[PDB]
Design a protein around this nucleic acid. Structure first.
Ligand SMILES: [Mg+2]
Ligand SMILES: [Mg+2]
Ligand SMILES: [Mg+2]
Ligand SMILES: [Mg+2]
Ligand SMILES: [Mg+2]
Ligand SMILES: [Mg+2]
Ligand SMILES: [Mg+2]
Ligand SMILES: [Mg+2]
Ligand SMILES: [Mg+2]
Ligand SMILES: [Mg+2]
Ligand SMILES: [Mg+2]
Ligand SMILES: [Mg+2]
Ligand SMILES: [Mg+2]
Ligand SMILES: [Mg+2]
Ligand SMILES: [Mg+2]
Ligand SMILES: [Mg+2]
Ligand SMILES: [Mg+2]
Ligand SMILES: [Mg+2]
Ligand SMILES: [Mg+2]
Ligand SMILES: [Mg+2]
Ligand SMILES: [Mg+2]
Ligand SMILES: [Mg+2]
Ligand SMILES: [Mg+2]
Ligand SMILES: [Mg+2]
Ligand SMILES: [Mg+2]
Ligand SMILES: [Mg+2]
Ligand SMILES: [Mg+2]
Ligand SMILES: [Mg+2]
Ligand SMILES: [Mg+2]
Ligand SMILES: [Mg+2]
Ligand SMILES: [Mg+2]
Ligand SMILES: [Mg+2]
Ligand SMILES: [Mg+2]
Ligand SMILES: [Mg+2]
Ligand SMILES: [Mg+2]
Lengths: 122, 48, 109, 48
RNA sequence: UUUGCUCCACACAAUAUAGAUGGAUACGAAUAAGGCGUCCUUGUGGCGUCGCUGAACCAUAGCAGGCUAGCAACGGUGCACUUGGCGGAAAGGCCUUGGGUGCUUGCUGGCGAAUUGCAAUGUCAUUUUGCGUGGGGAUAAAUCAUUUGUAUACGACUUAGAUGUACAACGGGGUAUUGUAAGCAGUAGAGUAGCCUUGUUGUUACGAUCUGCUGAGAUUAAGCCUUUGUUGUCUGAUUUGU
RNA sequence: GUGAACAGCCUCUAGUUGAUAGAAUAAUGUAGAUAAGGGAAGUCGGCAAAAUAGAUCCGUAACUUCGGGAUAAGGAUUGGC
RNA sequence: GAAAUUGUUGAAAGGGAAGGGCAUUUGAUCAGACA
């Protein structure tokens, strides 16, 4: 949602010409981060490890409202509201390995080259 | 340095300056030297 | 650090106000001062004494004087902890002519 | 730096202003001795 | 921002591949003329020779090529090294010296090979990347923000900013623009009043304007010039690796 | 108050200071303006714009239904004390 | 609690549209079938 918008230098930080400062978003999002930092202190999670894991937002049911256009005509004039939701998580390291073991399957002319590669060589 | 030699007569003319405007270009200047200035107006309420 | 200081400055408004649209000049004048205060003290927080306001709007909107003698007092902020620990406070200083006065430092008390 | 004006005689044997004074405008470029600090050699290559 | 980078070495792990599988094997010029050998007087020369295709040339035998002995040669060749030289058209390749070392199918021997079961590509090239190791080598900047105006709709461009011919804020001097400030004084002033001690300038004042101090006063970089004075500031933010 | 004036412009009383803001000041605009020398050559055409303007005084044509035409035209003067 | 349509995550492709047909490489995924 960017087309026909300003250009600022402050966007080189993310590789982008067009970039904004939409206050009333920030304030609603950071007022919801703040709410998870609560719930995490309350859950006993290490407040240092925390990283935002999931933060989607989709459309909330609109708001009607009208506007008065030329020659005695009405036009919609709608609010566009939002569901936000975020999830923070204790960061953590590693994952080890562990998986299958690959069930190797090779013809009799294919175990031959094998068990001769040992008989023949190292 | 130019990229061809000009036989332009209009070039080769060996010019010789007579006078060079030293009068201030921050207005309608009259005086080249403060010399010339003090010499013409006389002395003022600051000064000697 | 801090420092807690008061000095008395002049400011050329005329230069900072040259060109400015009339109905905006005296408002730009106010603002320009605030600007002038952070240049010197370092403080985002800047307050103008209501007299300094009159001192400004002395001559209607378009009629700001060219020069203004100011008292910029830097002081420590108090209560509900604002971002910065400090603020400025501009007061007008009763001089006959603001011409040719350069910046003095005020020793207080 | 800017321009100024000059007065000089003229040597256009033919013109109505031959051996007469004329006043011409002249710019003036500030040109303090440049300093040599490196050297480069180039080469012809079927590409340039 | 948790030991990050780079070049040399191996180790694992990935991921790819317009498509290895003995060798891209170097004059130039002519074509109703040339290649090569050879002789000479060194020429547009004498003599000879070749072509008629690279079907050539070189290489090619040994567990996808193992393990071994010996003779004859004194040759070849693979590798790491060292000497001297050449190459800028994209040089990144060529050549030459000298030791060391493996191989030699130049020739003669000893041993091995099955059972991959009658074929199943029967796996042997080189791509880029990533993770630890240790053997050298190296210790920057760019961006936001602030700022200049040689630039600008926004981005962009052009300057500046860790302590100095630094930068800003005032102040001073130059440079300009206007046309003589406020104040004070006067025997300037058409003139008007008021108290007499009714004038041998009678006095107190008042009067657009005038004159003096006064080319004075005001303004002057906001895209003028300059500065030994005055005062202040001089590490916030983020990003980047072959 | 100026002035012919309930005009315009400024003020007393009373009433407002309501009309999204902030930063800039590119092109192109809308609305307000000036421009050397020339002066309708512009354009369908003076479209637009500009010039005139109050008051006092001098001066005033053709034509006329004698009522006009007529502020015709053309001119001078205008503060302050 | 379908669709149009939207948010996040996962995979894949994209040198002036995208979608489609025959065929096959590649990756992912799945049935059946042996005895
Ligand atoms: Mg567009
Ligand atoms: Mg637009
Ligand atoms: Mg835009
Ligand atoms: Mg409307
Ligand atoms: Mg209606
Ligand atoms: Mg084998
Ligand atoms: Mg000038
Ligand atoms: Mg000051
Ligand atoms: Mg302007
Ligand atoms: Mg690290
Ligand atoms: Mg030859
Ligand atoms: Mg010879
Ligand atoms: Mg010869
Ligand atoms: Mg051959
Ligand atoms: Mg053998
Ligand atoms: Mg061998
Ligand atoms: Mg061999
Ligand atoms: Mg193999
Ligand atoms: Mg330092
Ligand atoms: Mg400062
Ligand atoms: Mg005078
Ligand atoms: Mg005066
Ligand atoms: Mg005096
Ligand atoms: Mg500008
Ligand atoms: Mg000084
Ligand atoms: Mg409106
Ligand atoms: Mg800007
Ligand atoms: Mg015409
Ligand atoms: Mg008109
Ligand atoms: Mg005019
Ligand atoms: Mg007239
Ligand atoms: Mg008169
Ligand atoms: Mg339901
Ligand atoms: Mg496609
Ligand atoms: Mg298909």
């Amino acid at each position: 949602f960017n087309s026909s918008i300003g250009r600022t230098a402050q966007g080189k930080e993310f590789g982008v010409t067009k970039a904004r400062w939409p206050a009333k978003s920030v304030k609603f999002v950071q007022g919801l981060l703040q709410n998870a930092a609560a719930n995490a202190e309350a859950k006993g999670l290490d407040a240092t490890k925390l990283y935002v894991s999931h933060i989607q937002v989709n459309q909330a049911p609109k708001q009607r409202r009208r506007t008065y256009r030329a020659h005695g005509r009405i036009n919609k004039y709608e609010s566009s509201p939002s569901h936000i939701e975020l999830v923070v998580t204790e960061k953590e390291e590693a994952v080890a390995k562990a998986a299958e073991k690959k069930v190797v399957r090779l013809t009799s002319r294919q175990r031959g080259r094998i068990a001769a590669q040992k008989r023949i060589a190292a | 340095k130019s990229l061809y030699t000009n036989t332009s007569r209009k070039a080769l003319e060996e010019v010789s300056l007579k006078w060079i405007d030293t009068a201030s270009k921050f207005g309608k200047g009259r005086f080249q030297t403060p010399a010339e200035k003090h010499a013409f107006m006389g002395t003022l309420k600051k000064d000697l | 650090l801090k420092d807690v200081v008061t000095r008395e400055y002049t400011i050329n408004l005329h230069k900072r106000l040259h060109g400015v649209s009339f109905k905006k000049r005296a408002p730009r004048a106010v603002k320009e001062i605030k600007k002038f205060a952070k240049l010197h003290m370092g403080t985002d927080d800047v307050r103008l004494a209501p007299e300094l306001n009159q001192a400004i709007w002395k001559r209607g909107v378009k009629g700001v004087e060219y020069r203004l003698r100011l008292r910029i007092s830097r002081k420590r902020n108090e209560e509900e902890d604002a971002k910065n620990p400090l603020f400025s406070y501009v007061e007008p200083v009763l001089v006959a002519s603001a011409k040719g006065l350069q910046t003095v430092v005020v020793e207080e008390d | 730096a800017g321009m100024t004006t000059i007065v000089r005689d003229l040597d256009r044997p033919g013109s109505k202003f031959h051996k007469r004074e004329v006043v011409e405008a002249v710019t003036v470029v500030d040109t303090p001795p440049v300093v040599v600090v490196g050297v480069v050699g180039y080469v012809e290559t079927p590409r340039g």
